[PDB]
């Protein structure tokens, strides 16, 4: 299907992934 | 030196009048003739050039050369056929910006370290009591000139070098030139042929203790003894530190791997048929991608962390590279007064009742040191309190008893400190019993008497308490006080007393005995006139109570530290300027010389033969007087340093300190000296690292060192040596981890040019992988601990085991880097084939792929692409390569956590390493998913299924290194350990 | 220096290192080849697994020009020899002798017909029959067309094509009185194509644009679509459209851009060759 693949949505998922990992790392170093 | 000259000769030599002094007319004109009376100012500080000498250092040379080459390539490309690609200019600007950014950070961490010493050095007394025209003047010491007679009272510092002509019991505490805590008397007579050890001259900036001495100046300003011995700028500043030598080897012999690899592929482009100008562009590109722009900003931060950690232990470090030089430290050097000993004398032993009650510096009388309940001890304390003529300074009740300055004789100072520690406030005891009469203290009598009453209010029996060495009082003493019962002259008790005495003067100690004879009331009534000049007491017929020992003890933490240093493979050598007996005794007490090791003197005394008769090599430990060093050639010094073992030098002048330090350095060893006085300054300047005390250190040796101990605890030096070994290991591991990410940055361009396939990795992505995700892991690799054998490890040989060797380069460039590049290329093929370009169709397509006009490039399946769409696919392949490199770097770092122990065995106890992994992945995800940046940093989002493409390669590399480490552990000394263990 | 014949080049004997490296690299090549092959096993050979990066196809022009500017002198044949040579080289595939019946090609409706498909993408059917497109449609030059005869009757006829995309059937717009206002155009089976550039600003009506193709409508006939694959439809003949400018002024620099309208055809700012198409024409006398 030549239509767009989940764009404007995959960016949300990637940003959520990055934020989750950054927060987990900060929590681990702090604690 | 003109100390042998008579007083009359000196007076005419400097025109000085031996009584009138120097007239005002002569002094005024001669002041400007010979300059002011101050030390020459230190060498000019290049405030603006020092910063520019930090960003041109050993490692920054590579980046500056790399930055210049990048601009050359872009300038070449613009000149030839129009290439809008500024990828060789974007790299060039950011390459230089790394040097400048890290140059400022290095300077800020160094200028601040030099901003503390400014407050350390502040003292401007500048006062003197000189006689001009026969009148005394409290004039400032800055104008003191040669040719006037000066007067010194007690408690003030000297104005300059003097020729003492008239002294009345004047004792001067040098502790800086001769290295003597004991204040020696000053007399107009001659003592030795060496003016340093003479008795009729006084040295610069040596504060007096007691007595008034009149002397004529001889040398003032920069020409005095302190003027020249403390003005040696020597040669180069500590030459090259061990860490800086490793960097110079890491550059000049591992930039060849860039030149060879670049050149070996430069001719390949010519063989293929590329143009002359394009070939050099390939060579410049491949030779500059080999320099990592994440190693200068990691090594500098890695060393900063260690210094910050050592700053918490009050180990102030001057040079940023001075952390490592204490690591290797093949041999160490020390002193005596100031460094090993507290420069103050305290009680050490009290011999009575046929027993030795060794005084304990420990604050609890550890190991049943003395019997504190016996009446003899109480009587000894009372005699000590009465006989003391010193006074504790008021307003000091809030300070530790041993760390408070007092006024009086040094022996009386030790006595007062001991009495205060034992009982309490000595002033109450002193005021309880009123004084009646006193006797003078001088070298002519060598025995001091004192008249005092009794503690009990009733039966005030008159007693003449006395102090003096029993070797001259035994003929003046008849009976003995022993716990109430009196022991007269006999061949048993007196022989036991002599036996106890014998092992008290053999410890380099001046025994000060205690005597007190009770004058009877039948012949000496209450109202008996007491005259100091007249004879009214009984010199003989005295009795003995106890003995005291005034030897200055070594520091509390020095014996354990010296023992750990010796057990750590470091040879400890003692150099000082004291009499050989005291220095040898102090060394034996500290532990510098092993217990039971007999020197050549003891061997000679064993069979009563001259020391020449016994073969020199028989005795391992030897002590050599300083007067033989001037008659010792370089070969003799080398042979004694090599053939023998741990040794002690005595009566060594600072020039001899320089000689021995240079001789020890000549034999391919790294020498660290731990001096504290002013006479150790040249040695600290020349030694590979100079550790100097801060609380009691001098004013010019403190500033001429590399590390300064604020706490003055010697154990900090063994902490520093362990930290140096640990930081060397961590730096090696971090360098390996930074270097292994080079092949996945060179191979893409190689395949893009040689195989003619679309570019797998761009230039901005290389900068991102070098500065954003390979930095925090590289720093965090230096926070880890080492294997449990870091203390017993033999010192590293600075000529066999380097920071970077062929093994590390092979490991980074042949296996690990190849696996990383393979994973990246697999991801690239995956993502360029999921869109239409099958792997078999990519060969020989770069010429049409990069063409702007060709907008109908047919792929494997058949459909055609325009330029922009295929460029978008190429850029998302770039992001895929970046993500794959990050995923592989996960395992790359996990397997680089250790060198021998496996990951499971050592354990992942590092709390910053996991944060490093998670921050790495978070930056990789955010930088490849943030909207609106694909137009600037050129990264497009990728499908979620493409994150997992690099997992098998990470698993494979982790398994491979686990197997390798198991092989290394199971077969020590094998082929794998020989050829792989970097 | 690295000596020889006495003890060896840095010791060595150079067998353990060489053997270890060669076996390690052999194993690495093996695992790489295995990974590539197992990857290849998960993708099809008839349709791509992803097609989103291929936007609505770009309308690239067939005359290949380096500086995207057609500059030539009509008097001198050598000035425009390369252009006509490239055009004839490209169009030699479209000649009537190359197109033949009997499962080599197929007969197709003269009028623009519906985009008839051939079936599924599976391999149960061999090479599906493809349409035909001779050069008889291109013409209107008061004579034979050849490809680029070479006279000065305006300019050498440039002809434009749509980038073939797998399994793609374009949809013409379907409404009344849209933003496009042509003289004659019906919604089905033709994608309207307009050639206007910098109008009312600098062009000021330099020349007249004449399009001739199939069905007299300015567009690509839909009966040719959709593509099925090089492995499935070899020698596929994509529809072509030809344009000619007759009263084009000489010694004048003008910018003309041709674009194709469509419901499913998209336009982009960064991509200057997607959907729309920009070209420069310069003629000197």
Author numbering:
A (entry chain G): 28 to 58
B (entry chain A): 32 to 1013
C (entry chain B): 19 to 303
Structure paper excerpt:
P2-type ATPase sodium-potassium pumps (Na+/K+-ATPases) are ion-transporting enzymes that use ATP to transport Na+ and K+ on opposite sides of the lipid bilayer against their electrochemical gradients to maintain ion concentration gradients across the membranes in all animal cells. By utilizing energy from the hydrolysis of a single ATP, the Na+/K+-ATPase pumps three Na+ ions out and two K+ ions into the cell in each transport cycle. In this work, we focused on structural and functional characterization of the human α3 Na+/K+-ATPase that comprises α3, β1 and FXYD6. Here, we determined the cryo-EM structures of the human Na+/K+-ATPase in five intermediate states during its transport cycle, including the cytoplasmic side-open (E1), AMPPCP-bound cytoplasmic side-open (E1•ATP), ADP-AlF4− trapped Na+-occluded (E1•P-ADP), BeF3− trapped exoplasmic side-open (E2P) and MgF42− trapped K+-occluded (E2•Pi) states.
To trap Na+/K+-ATPase in its non-occluded states, we substituted the four cation-binding residues (E324, E776, D801 and D805) of the α3 into alanine to completely diminish the affinities of Na+ and K+ binding. Using this cation-binding deficient 4A mutant Na+/K+-ATPase, we determined three cryo-EM structures of the Na+/K+-ATPase in its exoplasmic side-open state at 3.9-Å resolution, as mimicked the E2P state, and its cytoplasmic side-open states at 3.4-Å and 3.5-Å resolutions, as mimicked the E1 and E1•ATP, respectively. The structure of the exoplasmic side-open human α3 is nearly identical to that of the pig kidney α1 Na+/K+-ATPase (r.m.s.d. ~ 0.9 Å) stabilized in the E2P conformation by BeF3− bound to the Aspartate 366 residues of the P domain. All the subunits and ten transmembrane helices of the human α3 subunit overlap perfectly with those of the pig kidney α1 subunit confirming that the cation-binding deficient 4A mutant is functionally and structurally relevant. In consistency with the functional data, our structural data also showed a virtually identical structure of the human α3 4A mutant and the pig α1 WT ATPase in the exoplasmic side-open state. In the exoplasmic side-open state, the A domain tilts ~7o along the vertical axis in the presence of BeF3− relative to that of the K+-occluded state. Along with the conformational change of the A domain, the M1–M2 and M3–M4E helices rotate ~15 o and 14o, respectively horizontally as a whole rigid body in the K+-occluded compared to those in the exoplasmic side-open states. In the exoplasmic side-open state, the rotation of M4E distances V319 from L798 of M6 helix (12.6 Å Cα–Cα distance) and thereby creates an open K+ entry pathway along M4E and M6 helices. Our structural insights of the human α3 Na+/K+-ATPase in its exoplasmic-side open state re-emphasizes the rearrangement of the M4E20 relative to the M6 helix to open the ion pathway toward the exoplasm.
